[PDB]
């Protein structure tokens, strides 16, 4: 995983991925979000899924939340309060141990960052007014700092892997939705059906009519749907209204 001061960003589109398997697992120590409950994650459909991944120190996992301050929350990553997503953080003690020092983060910056900004730079920040360039000196400071992720550290010092998921509420035509449930089929019974949006009531029978390879459901007159093919089997069926009198 990439370091926090250069957070890894990825875009996911045109897929249907179940979100239940995430919070149903046990490895994910922290599964935090308020914009949507875990139950209705798969129920809703979203657009422009973005994933941000990095590795940080444990004791500051709280700092990744809408509207918080701190070195990581101001100079390495920014989280707007109007955030529509979720956060998944889990321990990686046995995956990032020795200690190891190849990690870096931003320590000094002019000011805060705009939401989802990527803060990449390398300058000798000066704690005074004298201009120093080329080499560090008095009141000249190095912008970055490393992490001592020793394998024998306690809680709060072990490295934690953090993934933040963001999205938009279908501001464009739908791209990524949740999984859709399916059931079996019955015949010669008065049943109400919901075939991929087309809802109705009646009795289902087998048919000998022939469709072209691209239609989905036929009819006869006066908006009376009569024949529908099941998407799973591509087999044409017949609808007949249930008896009354």
């Amino acid at each position, epitope marked *: 995983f990439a370091s926090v001061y250069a957070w890894n960003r990825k875009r996911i589109s045109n897929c249907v991925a179940d979100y239940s398997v995430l919070y149903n697992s046990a490895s994910f120590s922290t599964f935090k979000c308020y914009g949507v409950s875990p139950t209705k994650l798969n129920d809703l459909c979203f657009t422009n899924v973005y994933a941000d991944s990095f590795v940080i120190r444990g004791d500051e996992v709280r700092q990744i939340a809408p509207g918080q301050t701190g070195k990581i929350a101001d100079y390495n990553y920014k989280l707007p309060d109007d955030f529509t997503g979720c956060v998944i953080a889990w321990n990686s003690n046995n995956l990032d141990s020795k200690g190891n020092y190849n990690y870096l983060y931003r320590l000094f910056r002019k000011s805060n960052l705009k939401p989802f900004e990527r803060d990449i730079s390398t300058e000798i920040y000066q704690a005074g007014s004298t201009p120093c360039n080329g080499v560090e000196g008095f009141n000249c400071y190095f912008p970055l700092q490393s992490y*001592g992720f020793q394998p024998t550290n306690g*809680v709060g*010092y072990q490295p934690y892997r953090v993934v933040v998921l963001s999205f938009e509420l279908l501001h464009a035509p739908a791209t990524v939705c949740g999984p859709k449930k399916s059931t079996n089929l019955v015949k010669n019974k008065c049943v109400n059906f919901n075939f991929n949006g087309l809802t109705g009531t009646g009795v289902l029978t087998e048919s000998n009519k022939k469709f072209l390879p691209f239609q989905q459901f036929g009819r006869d007159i006066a908006d009376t749907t009569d024949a529908v093919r099941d998407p799973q089997t591509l087999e044409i069926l017949d609808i007949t209204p249930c008896s009354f009198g």
Partner: antibody
Amino acid sequence: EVQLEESGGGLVKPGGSLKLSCAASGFTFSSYTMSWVRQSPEKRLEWVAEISSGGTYTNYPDTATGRFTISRDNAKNTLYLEMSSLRSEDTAMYYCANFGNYEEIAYWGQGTLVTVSA
Amino acid sequence: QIVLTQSPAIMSVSLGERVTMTCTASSSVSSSYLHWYQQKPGSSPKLWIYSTSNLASGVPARFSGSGSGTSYSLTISSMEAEDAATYYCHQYHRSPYTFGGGTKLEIKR
């Protein structure tokens, strides 16, 4: 809590071995890494050796590579520490404290005078 | 490992004024790993300034200081009677954990 009470010390012989037991109770010992530090009379503090309660891991400085042993027991909550063939230069006073654990490092031990005699 | 060196050995500084103390090291240790204890005579040390900027419990917001890199500075506001104590620099980045050289803070009449 009772602040990491340590086993009592006393005068020993240059060639024996004294055991320090930092048994305590008051907070979880399955995730808190212990540590042992010593101070000679009017001399800089020096970290002796720590143990990791997460996996009961042993690692400690190279000033004395093979003469320090630590055993942890979360059952009765005891921290056993000894050295092999102590010399007359090893007289000091020892603390058992909390290193590596949660950020708010605190709860230094009451101390115990581990002195040698001739 | 990196040894912690204190530039002043002892401060025979009178009451009232405001001075600074320095912790020097051969290389940069961390932005926030170091800390300072206070070993009272015949007692156990207690930490006040942690993370190189933050303050622990019991600090009257009098003890302060800032720095980064190979040298760090700790500042005061005004000396009083309870400042006659001991200070110790610390480092936790590298595997061998060391302590500061120590300063025997004392007041002068």
